[PDB]
Amino acid sequence: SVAGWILGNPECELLISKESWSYIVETPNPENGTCYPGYFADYEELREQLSSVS
Amino acid sequence: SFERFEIFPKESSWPNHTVTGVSASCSHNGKSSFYRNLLWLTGKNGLYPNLSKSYVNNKEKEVLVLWGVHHPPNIGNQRALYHTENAYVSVVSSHYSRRFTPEIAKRPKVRDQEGRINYYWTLLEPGDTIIFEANGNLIAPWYAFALSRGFGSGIITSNAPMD
Amino acid sequence: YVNNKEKEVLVLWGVHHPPNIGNQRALYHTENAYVSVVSSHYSRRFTPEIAKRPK
Amino acid sequence: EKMNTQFTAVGKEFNKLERRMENLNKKVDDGFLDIWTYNAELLVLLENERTLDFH
């Protein structure tokens, strides 16, 4: 998931050299997100802002 | 479904706190009473043992629980019913947590009463857990609500006769 | 930190809430900690919250 | 028959500190109301001449 990968989970290491894009494709049930449990503040706004970068 | 079911029985879940808390602002049929789903907790033998209760949603459907925190208007009343000056409550869950603290200040009179109760609510999931930890000024739940939300609806305000 | 680049930068940080006061004092040697982040138009003061939570 | 229908909600409520939502909700609701008046009306006025000319 976006939060799991942005925070740098030990998994999701295969997608470091994919800097530029047009959009992000997820999995219907993304499992390996954040390891330590918690409440990710302003989650939704982060996804929208990171939906497009150069 | 809206099964209103006992969650924290008043006769067995609070052996060490007085549960008959009444307010003159909610009088019913000429005598003081209180809400019929909440419970004002006070001291006993001049002692208010900090409470720590838990609940597991055994049912196979969402449950809705309410609770509130009481803000006394003066420090004298706060120490009278709780024997402490800086209380704190806490309500944790699997993916939900907050830590409320009381706020004491003089407020304009509303319904011949100054103190304020801030009500809060949440939701659980099948098999989820909710833990109440507090040392004062907690209005614990007494009745929950198991709900079966179906594809949403709307609310109407009107005065038409029932037919 | 000063954003020397000519581009926006995104930074992340977190605050750890221990489950018991014993662990809190073990790794930090204090009972009432506090963290704070500030910028030109951004400032908040987080504080830890200790309580028993479901596993 | 082409008036496809679905469950619809009423304009919700908001507290005094979220007035931006109320005006946004009014703008979208009034936009559809203005659209359907002109769209529906000009259809039965243009297609009333079509049937009159047909006769």
Ligand SMILES: *[C@@H]1O[C@H](CO)[C@@H](O)[C@H](O)[C@H]1NC(C)=O
């Ligand atoms: C990743 O997800 C799998 C299930 O899909 C789980 O068994 C595993 O413990 C997870 N590990 C991490 C590091 O997220």
Ligand SMILES: *[C@@H]1O[C@H](CO)[C@@H](O)[C@H](O)[C@H]1NC(C)=O
């Ligand atoms: C309540 O009081 C009894 C004895 O007065 C004590 O054993 C118990 O630990 C207290 N706390 C409860 C029942 O939560």
Ligand SMILES: *[C@@H]1O[C@H](CO)[C@@H](O)[C@H](O)[C@H]1NC(C)=O
């Ligand atoms: C309750 O308060 C007493 C002292 O007032 C303290 O020793 C005890 O650890 C507290 N228990 C909880 C569960 O906070």
